Amino acid sequence: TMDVAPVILAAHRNNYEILTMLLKQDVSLPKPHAVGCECTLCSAKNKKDSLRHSRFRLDIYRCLASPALIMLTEEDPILRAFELSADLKELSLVEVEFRNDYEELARQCKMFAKDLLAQARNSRELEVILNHTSMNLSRLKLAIKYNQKEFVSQSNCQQFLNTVWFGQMSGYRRKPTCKKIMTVLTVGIFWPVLSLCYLIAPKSQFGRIIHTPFMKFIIHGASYFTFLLLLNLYSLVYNEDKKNTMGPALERIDYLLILWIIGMIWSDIKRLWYEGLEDFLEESRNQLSFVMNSLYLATFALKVV
Amino acid sequence: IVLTKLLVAMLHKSFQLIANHEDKEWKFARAKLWLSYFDDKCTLPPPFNRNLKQKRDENYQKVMCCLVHRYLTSMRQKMQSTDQATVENLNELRQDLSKFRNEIRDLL
Amino acid sequence: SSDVDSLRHSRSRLNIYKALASPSLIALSSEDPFLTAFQLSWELQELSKVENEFKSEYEELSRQCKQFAKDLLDQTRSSRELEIILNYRDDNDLARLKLAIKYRQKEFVAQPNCQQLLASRWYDEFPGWRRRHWAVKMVTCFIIGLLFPVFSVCYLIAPKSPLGLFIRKPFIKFICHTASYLTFLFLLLLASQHIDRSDLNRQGPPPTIVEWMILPWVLGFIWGEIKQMWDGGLQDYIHDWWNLMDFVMNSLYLATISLKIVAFVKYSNPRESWDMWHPTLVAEALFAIANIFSSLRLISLFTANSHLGPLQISLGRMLLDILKFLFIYCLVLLAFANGLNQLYFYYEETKGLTCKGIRCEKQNNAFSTLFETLQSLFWSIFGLINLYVTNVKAQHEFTEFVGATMFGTYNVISLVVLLNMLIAMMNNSYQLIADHADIEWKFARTKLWMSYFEEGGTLPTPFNVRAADNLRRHHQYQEVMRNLVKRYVAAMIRDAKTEEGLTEENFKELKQDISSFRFEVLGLL
Amino acid sequence: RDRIPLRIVRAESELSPSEKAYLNAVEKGDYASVKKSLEEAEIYFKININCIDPLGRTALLIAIENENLELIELLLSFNVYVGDALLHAIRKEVVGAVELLLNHQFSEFTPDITPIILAAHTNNYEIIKLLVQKGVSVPRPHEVRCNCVECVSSSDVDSLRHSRSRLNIYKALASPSLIALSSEDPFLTAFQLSWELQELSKVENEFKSEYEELSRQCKQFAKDLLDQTRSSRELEIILNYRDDLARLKLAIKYRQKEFVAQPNCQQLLASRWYDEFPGWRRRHWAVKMVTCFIIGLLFPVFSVCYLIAPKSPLGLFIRKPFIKFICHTASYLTFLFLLLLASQHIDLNRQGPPPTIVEWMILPWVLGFIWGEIKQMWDGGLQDYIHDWWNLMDFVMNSLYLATISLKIVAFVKYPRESWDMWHPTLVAEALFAIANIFSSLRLISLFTANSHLGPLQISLGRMLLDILKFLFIYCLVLLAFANGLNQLYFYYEETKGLTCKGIRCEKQNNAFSTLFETLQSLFWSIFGLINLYVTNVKAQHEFTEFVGATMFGTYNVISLVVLLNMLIAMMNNSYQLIADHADIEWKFARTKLWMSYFEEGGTLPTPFNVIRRAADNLRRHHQYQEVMRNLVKRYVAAMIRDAKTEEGLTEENFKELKQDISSFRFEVLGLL
Amino acid sequence: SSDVDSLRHSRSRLNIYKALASPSLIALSSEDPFLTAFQLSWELQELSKVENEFKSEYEELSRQCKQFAKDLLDQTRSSRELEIILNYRDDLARLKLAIKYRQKEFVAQPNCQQLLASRWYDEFPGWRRRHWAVKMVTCFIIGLLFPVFSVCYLIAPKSPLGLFIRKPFIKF
Amino acid sequence: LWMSYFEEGGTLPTPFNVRAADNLRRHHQYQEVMRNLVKRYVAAMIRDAKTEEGLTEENFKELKQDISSFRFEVLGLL
Amino acid sequence: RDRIPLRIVRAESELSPSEKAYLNAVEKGDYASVKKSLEEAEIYFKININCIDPLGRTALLIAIENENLELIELLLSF
Ligand SMILES: Cn1c(=O)n(CCCO)c(=O)c2c1nc(Oc1cccc(OC(F)(F)F)c1)n2Cc1ccc(Cl)cc1
Ligand SMILES: Cn1c(=O)n(CCCO)c(=O)c2c1nc(Oc1cccc(OC(F)(F)F)c1)n2Cc1ccc(Cl)cc1
Ligand SMILES: [Ca+2]
Ligand SMILES: [Ca+2]
Ligand SMILES: [Zn+2]
Ligand SMILES: [Zn+2]
């Protein structure tokens, strides 16, 4: 096609040698426009030749999505692969006419990022490329933020996440399934003791227990289970003559229940403030939490009224 | 009789489609939950509720240069070990044979 | 090493296990490549279960080792080689076959030659039983089933008798065991119908009609299950679900016997005046549940049949996925049940009604307590709960509407979403296990065959109550297995020359070769 | 010991440098170096000419797998030992078989493989032709139901060797090339061999897939051999070869569905079907159903015209097979219309006078059905009648009609409806007549095979009916278990005091679990939700017994509705995915069977009206058939040779041959220069 | 000839129709290979309808012709070329012909769908680029104000409100 | 649907609806553009058919027979 | 008998050994031997130019499947 430069075709055939001689000659491709750019030029090229403009954009975004051009001329190929996959997915959402091609280029960028992380040998190298910001896991936070399914399902990344998640007791996987079951149970019983001892003395070994994120999840699940048990206990202790009397009266169970409710609304406020609002609206679990909290707040407001 | 069984057929094809990309999606969601729980922002349950940058960039550049080298070698290894010979490669081989024969005839 | 470099250690372990599990190394350096393949497949399975990372490589390695063992058996070409392989022991035994069955080598056992040897041993002293008309097969199975007690007493009197040795044939032994179980089921079916007494007796005396004939057979079952618990270990007992159900049934029969003799010795009056927890009523109900557990054992008897054994095996495969989805169903059921209970339990009424709960002529107090709400939401899947359970006898229209909305939402979920998801998931699961159904059925049938191959347990359920030889066996096994290894490596190299594959490397190889020849010619000429 | 030492337990004889260098020289392909090596081996005896590689490659074997003949001639010059190297050359498809035949331990091949068996296994035409020309004979396999003393003696000595020999022999005979060379009649040989191999697959549950693959290969070879026909005269010669369409009837008998559904045979069958007609496929649909109706009404006219004089033009119109199929369909539809008139239009008569308004016309149709089924069951084979399920349905409906008319005659000659006995012969006659009416009007599914759209659907139903029976067995066992258990717990709560309707078929369902028969019925009806929950109530105030009964009933519902009844849907879906790929072929075979059921003159009148030189000719037929078959075999051999080399995939030994060729040319240039 | 040798006649017709349906012969000998591909696909479909035997061969030939037409649409590289092809007539007359002859491969072409989406959203840019709530709001306010645009073009066709009905999206 | 709604007829909803030189120029324009189209098409199928294709037995036979003929020609020359 | 006898019922055409050598040399793509064989076939010899294999592989057809332009030119020349 008449709009194809030699470097664009070189990126299309994806050969590293042709690239490493061609970019020695100081070659730069045209910059494609934004997702919804409608400037004085972009609204005129669509009038001029829509098919030619669309083929030019597809050729440019196939030239940029080649692994050779990412690995040669960028500061961070992982970040370029992430941004290019996100941009290509957004263009495939916008460009209805070429959904398969832009989706395929996004898939190729994701696969390139997955393999480039799969060439990690040492655990030190993996920690370096996962903690890089432009245990902290900023790059993995970006990878989840950019919806990279192949990058995080890799065995090395999942193994590092396992070692971070299990904490001190890395031999928990070495334990049999019965021992894992009774360990989970015996942490699930005395969870308020661990929470209180962290709130008082975090220096000791039981203080550091809650900073294990698997353990943090276990006390969180046991706390929600205790909330559920108190909810059943409300009906088991629903004998405050409320079955007959008109005016609501709050028991000790309802006092604890509203304390849990303000705790969950405080966690909701922390999630909304530290991380944002849009990512809260993305997850269906957070939508369920929001509707639950609105329903409970309306229930208690009507109870007080 | 019609719509519900059409729904059953549609779900059969759909669950045939997701099941191949199933383990990857489950691991991605599990890692999302794990990184949600990795923070030190709120560790309590609901009821209780610069030259260093340059050195880090240099270390990252070294690690990424090594990774780019290894991935280039692995990519060319996989490319040379996976593609199949086509008829055009046969045509180059016929060309080399004919060029041998013509050079032999010209020299002799 | 994990604290220093966890990724390096894990990759090193994976590379070591990938090197040890190669067919060529195993065939060259391992002294016992069959046992080495079995142990390596088992260890790689445990590594796949423990290390959830790198799981695909570990299960591929285990599949490769099973492939190696199957190919090594496929390289046999004589019956004596098969007999000296399967009967070899570390220190008619079929010890290697027992160990391969223990190590869950499915395609090893499902090999045609091993199946041929096991079918030759299964129909011991039979002049072509399989070469028969199906009608003749049916009548001859009927007549060996009918003469079960005479063969039993012939073995008890004269073990050396031809009739006393007739039960030692594993097929006849299986037929007689099935005849004993079918007579047990017929005795229970007569116990349901022959009983025509007052059925009012306070203590329920044990009759001579069916009781004292169920009792021995029950304790023969108990003794047999105790023997299988001792012989083979507790892990082999709990590996099979069928043995677990057999243990549950025997425990229920023992509980029924204990409750009946308790009623004989204590509390020995119209039937309607009995308490709801009377020992005779509990014995009645436990006998009923033990009977529905005992009459389902004929499904385990169906692995021997060729036409439907794979079908029963496939159902046994996807029962686990059924339970996998029933956990999600249980979560939904608990959610909607306790929500509906939290709504309607302020409206509990009695009014002196004849019956309460869902199981009345007119349904009432369905969502009254948590137990009744769980029962009422369970039965709503099958439509046996009418729509008049959602309205209250009072005129609170809003609570009635939101209760009917919650009930309809749960019905929509558990009757459109979850059931059709279960259908689609079952569809994909049976599509996946349709290819592996034949080898699974053959493995299960060989397990059932080799259950009857042993010397012990010959009597049915009524009557249940050296170094030079080792060196010779070792040398015979070594020479046969050396021949097998040589044949396998020759066939593997020949297949390597057979596979339809030509990469771009070999075209470049020919191009470089012809260019080198040309440049040599031009240098010379 | 923190480290696994490795050693060679399977120790070989290894290679000295000189012998290894010689073997590598044969591997490269040098003429002069290998010639010098054998010249040194001849008179100094330093190395052995018959040397063995560690993985098993004597020099003749590398010279075989490199597919060159010069080193073959050179190695056979100094008499290098040859064992199974002829077999290795045969399996490599080398033209060096003549060189290895003309000359004068560890064997990868089994000792029971003679060269012609391996040549037929490789399915190479030139090798089999050369071996048959040289003189060879495949050993004859025994009967598939043979119990001779030699067979059982071989099974006692080595059963695996005997089974492998039988499988190798039947793989040798089933090869298309050996059938093309040796058999006098390739079609009859292919049919008989496919039948024999299917019977062996039924007999041998072990190695079942091998015999099934061999039978599929034989049927496919017959299909392609018919595919190579190029004229109508050749097709009419092939299909009418007796020893009419006699060969087509034989192919139907041997159940060759790929041969029958072949398109040109379908063209011949359509020509025999729509004979002397302006073209039914080239016609408008509404006109087609209009003329279907117009020969539907004119059924008795053509029938009586054939009855009085078949030589009439109207007596010859019926003689066309499509017209007699339309006449039979119209007669059956008239019979069903008579049944509907009997149901709609027809009291207190105890003896029950037979309804002569309708039943005097129905009885000739019943007699015609009995006559037709008797004639089909006796004249036309026995086991093929019981193989067809529609013939079993005809037998059931004819037995029911005979029982109905017998009971009505008995009740008429020797004998208030509400005062009748419950087992009165009139009531049993009515019940049997109703069930037989169900069967008679369900017989119309058999007429959907002639249609071009509903035929594949009907054939797909008829293939999973047997699998449905297989699942119904498991459900029946589960039903028996739960029914027997529920009968145990409730037998003693049998309430029969003044209810006037005991069972599940009253307004108030009572005693649903009070006996085994009623428990079986009530647990059957719980699939469709027609059993209410209050059937688990007793007359007393017991509660734990009620709860155990309710939880057993619920457990049955769960098992039979969520687990088993949804297992059945998935298993049907897999069965239909397996079936629908071959649905067109099976539909065409069944439609051909339906078509040529009307081709012959063994029954031309419809159902209700039918109760009123040789050696020279055989030589000519055999000569014509043999010439046509020679042409067909030549065309098939050329086509199979062409397609074989068209798609091969280029296995790596061809590239190894290329490298060895180029290395041999380089070494010959080095020797010449 | 069918009465003499029906098999040879049917094989002859199948061979001739397989020769005519070849893409190279169509591209080399036909005046209008798009029109030839359309007419040949329709003829092969009706031939498979008439000839119940040999139906798979004729269906394969028709699908091959449709694939050839789709590939010939793939080779275009300009909107001017698309406007020349689709508007050719001897108005999107060739696209009407593709609609009539049931050429789903030809019609569902990404370039043809690009032209169709350009013509459908007549002078309406950024409709897909704008937000879903925004575009549904615009659709709701156009559909709510339906009588004012439909009363126009009935009294004043040349008015801008009268010409608002000219856009096919507004008409839908 | 779109092309049914592209027509000038039926512009009113159901509420309120109750030369030779030009032909030669169009013919020549269509002809020229479709010479371009068929040239691109034959280039494309020639390029496609030259790759993603299996060589199989016939290509190996030709390639080996060329080496055999070359060897016999060299032996004839030398 | 317990052995199946095997024979060619349709024996078809047979070739002389000189004809077989001619066809094999044509398959090898030989210049000199094939040219010499046709030269002796010009005079009265056993070698027939129109030799057809029972596989239907004439030297013409073999050279067509051999694709050697020089060989097919030689065969059409005589
Ligand atoms: C959840 N829900 C419900 O609980 N009730 C019972 C309330 C008391 O009777 C309903 O009647 C009811 C209902 N959803 C309803 O619409 C559906 C939406 C989505 C799915 C669905 O079903 C399926 F998935 F497609 F199968 C049905 N409808 C019907 C309806 C009634 C009034 C109005 Cl204004 C609109 C719709
Ligand atoms: C067999 N069975 C039964 O008989 N009854 C009736 C008892 C008297 O009415 C029940 O109520 C009953 C029951 N299984 C039940 O849980 C299931 C679990 C998993 C699957 C399932 O199957 C399906 F997914 F629904 F298809 C059902 N429940 C509900 C239940 C009731 C009380 C309690 Cl504590 C816990 C659970
Ligand atoms: Ca047991
Ligand atoms: Ca019949
Ligand atoms: Zn712009
Ligand atoms: Zn015999």
Side-chain angles (χ1 to χ4, degrees), chain C residues 326 329-330 333 371 374-375 378-379 381, chain D residues 547 551 555 558 562:
Chain C
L326 287 188
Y329 161 72
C330 282
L333 176 57
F371 200 25
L374 282 151
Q375 290 174 187
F378 163 73
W379 283 113
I381 313 182
Chain D
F547 188 80
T551 189
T555 299
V558 162
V562 162

Side-chain angles (χ1 to χ4, degrees), chain E residues 2-36:
Chain E
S2 301
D3 305 310
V4 170
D5 263 8
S6 304
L7 196 32
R8 201 169 56 89
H9 178 91
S10 302
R11 193 81 81 230
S12 183
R13 280 210 287 103
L14 172 60
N15 278 1
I16 294 306
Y17 270 96
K18 195 186 300 310
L20 298 185
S22 181
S24 172
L25 191 51
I26 291 163
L28 253 186
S29 63
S30 187
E31 279 285 351
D32 196 302
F34 281 127
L35 176 57
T36 301

Side-chain angles (χ1 to χ4, degrees), chain D residues 130-295:
Chain D
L130 270 172
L131 286 185
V132 169
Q133 275 186 317
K134 201 70 175 183
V136 78
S137 289
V138 157
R140 175 193 304 279
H142 285 197
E143 195 210 2
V144 316
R145 260 75 195 262
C146 174
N147 284 350
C148 84
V149 59
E150 157 198 357
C151 271
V152 299
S153 174
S154 59
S155 302
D156 286 354
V157 167
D158 248 6
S159 65
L160 173 58
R161 182 71 56 84
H162 170 84
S163 149
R164 169 66 38 189
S165 70
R166 160 158 290 188
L167 184 55
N168 283 355
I169 279 311
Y170 277 109
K171 282 171 63 177
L173 295 179
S175 73
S177 319
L178 190 54
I179 299 159
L181 267 308
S182 100
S183 36
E184 181 86 69
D185 198 350
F187 279 134
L188 183 52
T189 307
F191 299 157
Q192 289 180 349
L193 197 37
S194 70
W195 196 260
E196 216 167 272
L197 283 165
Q198 205 64 32
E199 260 193 345
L200 281 146
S201 154
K202 260 175 44 92
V203 162
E204 305 263 4
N205 190 17
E206 322 175 319
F207 313 81
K208 195 173 192 61
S209 178
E210 277 83 5
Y211 288 112
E212 288 188 359
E213 160 67 28
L214 288 180
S215 64
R216 184 290 291 171
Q217 156 191 86
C218 293
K219 296 188 300 180
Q220 182 72 210
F221 159 72
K223 173 185 183 61
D224 316 302
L225 199 56
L226 194 66
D227 261 4
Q228 306 295 143
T229 56
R230 288 163 183 168
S231 180
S232 179
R233 292 305 106 86
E234 306 188 1
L235 201 68
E236 283 162 1
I237 281 301
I238 288 154
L239 296 193
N240 303 8
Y241 184 67
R242 294 181 91 121
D243 49 349
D244 210 352
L245 306 182
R247 189 142 302 268
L248 199 43
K249 305 243 187 58
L250 195 65
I252 284 185
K253 184 227 159 195
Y254 282 111
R255 262 147 271 182
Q256 307 270 120
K257 301 188 174 185
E258 291 105 340
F259 181 86
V260 163
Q262 209 265 348
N264 332 97
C265 162
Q266 286 296 281
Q267 278 196 342
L268 181 56
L269 285 161
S271 159
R272 297 259 304 189
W273 187 239
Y274 303 118
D275 64 321
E276 275 60 43
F277 258 48
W280 256 69
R281 308 157 183 271
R282 297 165 171 257
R283 202 58 40 99
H284 190 264
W285 53 290
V287 184
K288 277 149 50 174
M289 41 205 87
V290 155
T291 191
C292 268
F293 222 68
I294 213 61
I295 329 167

Side-chain angles (χ1 to χ4, degrees), chain A residues 33 37 39 42:
Chain A
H33 287 238
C37 191
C39 61
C42 285

